[PDB]
């Protein structure tokens, strides 16, 4: 029944488990036409996509908050592979969008449409420690339609460890993007670094995007993109979406916004099981995360 639930909700594409609604029209994603000045923001789900997106949007608008609030974020920054028959269509949104385009995606590098690589588009990749991602993704399953019942948190974590969740293995995702992140066109960031020193990462982002980093611009970005501001901003907190698709009464999208909430969810036994498995998955990579 749980396995049956997963079967009804998700289907594989290129070996990667995916929301079934997306897969039906995957040819649209496959043949997507990039432009050289497109910017890709790529993340494993729940790694702070919304956070870095708004920072990037502010950098584009030279810190003009009104310009950022002119439309909701999922319209300002289309979700590339996302498709709900005719109700939502990321590819369509991008096709009609005036450049310069900012593109959101959760795809592993092997699944990113070839055109982005061919045109050598800049990519910003953001990752977050796996435990915190797992917690966040768990509540996401609960709040959002199109997910199976995730069961108990230990049950969900078992699926997470095996990569049996939308977008597949977090382990492979981050490891693959880490290799790409050696390219000068790909900026590799950590959620935990944005928490620890937001100013340093914002400045890093400004330089990567070839803009000028003034104190005033940097200050505007920092407070506009802080958790408390974004939580209350209807342009960025997804509250304009109805409850029957995103039910924020169960759990808000802007949920806690901290590093270390895994300490509030993993039991000692689950933590031990998770840590052992994690080491085996990640031993052969120089990528290093902080869980606090
Ligand atoms: N301005 C901000 N500062 C810190 N965390 C933020 C943030 N905006 C969104 N997040 C967090 O990023 C996660 C959502 O990620 P995504 O945008 O990729 O779906 C949520 O994590 P939590 O559920 O742990 O609170 C959310 O709270
Ligand atoms: C596919 C999903 C669940 C989603 C949204 C975001 Br934001 C994500 O980052 C990831 Br991952 C998945 C979604 C939810 C609603 Br409600 C929708 O109306 C549509 Br169209 C798609
Ligand atoms: Na790089």
Numbering used by the authors: 2 to 293
The authors write:
In humans, there are 13 cytosolic sulfotransferases that catalyze the transfer of a sulfuryl group (SO3) from the donor cofactor 3´-phosphate 5´-phosphosulfate (PAPS) to acceptor substrates, including xenobiotics, fatty acids, neurotransmitters, and steroids. Sulfation of 17β-estradiol (E2) by human estrogen sulfotransferase (SULT1E1) results in loss of binding to the estrogen receptor as well as increased availability for renal excretion, thereby effectively regulating the concentration of E2. To understand the binding and inhibition of estrogen sulfotransferase by BFRs, we obtained crystal structures of SULT1E1 in complex with the product cofactor PAP and three different compounds bound at the active site: the natural substrate (E2), a BFR (TBBPA), and a human BFR metabolite (3-OH-BDE-47) at resolutions of 1.95 Å, 2.0 Å, and 2.05 Å, respectively. SULT1E1 crystallizes with two molecules in the asymmetric unit (designated molecule A and molecule B) representing the proposed physiological dimer.
The co-crystal structure of PAP and TBBPA bound to SULT1E1 reveals TBBPA binding in the same substrate binding pocket as E2. In molecule B, the position of the TBBPA is well determined because there is clear electron density for the entire molecule, with strong density for the first phenolic ring and slightly weaker density for the second ring, suggesting that this ring contains greater conformational flexibility. The first phenolic ring of TBBPA superimposes with the phenolic ring of E2, positioning the 4-hydroxyl within hydrogen bonding distance to the catalytic base His107, similar to the 3-hydroxyl of E2. In addition, this ring neatly fits between the steric gate residues Phe80 and Phe141. The second ring is located out of the plane with respect to E2 and extends into a different region of the hydrophobic binding pocket. The bromine (Br5) bound to the C5 carbon is buried in a hydrophobic cavity within van der Waal distance (4.3 Å) of Tyr20, Phe80, His107, Phe141, and Tyr168. Bromine atom Br3 is located in a more hydrophilic environment and is potentially able to form hydrogen or halogen bonds with Lys105 (3.1 Å) and/or Tyr239 (3.2 Å). Overall, the protein conformation of SULT1E1 with bound TBBPA is very similar to that with bound E2 with only a few minor changes in the substrate binding pocket. Binding of TBBPA results in increased sidechain order for Met247, whereas the sidechain of Ile246 becomes slightly more disordered and the conformation of loop residues 84–89 is altered (2.0 Å shift at Cα atom of Asn87 in molecule B). Although the electron density for TBBPA in molecule A is not as clear for the second ring, it appears that the overall position of the molecule is slightly shifted with respect to the position in molecule B. This shift is correlated with a shift in the loop (4.5 Å at Cα atom of Asn87 in molecule A compared with molecule B of the E2-bound structure) containing residues 84–89.
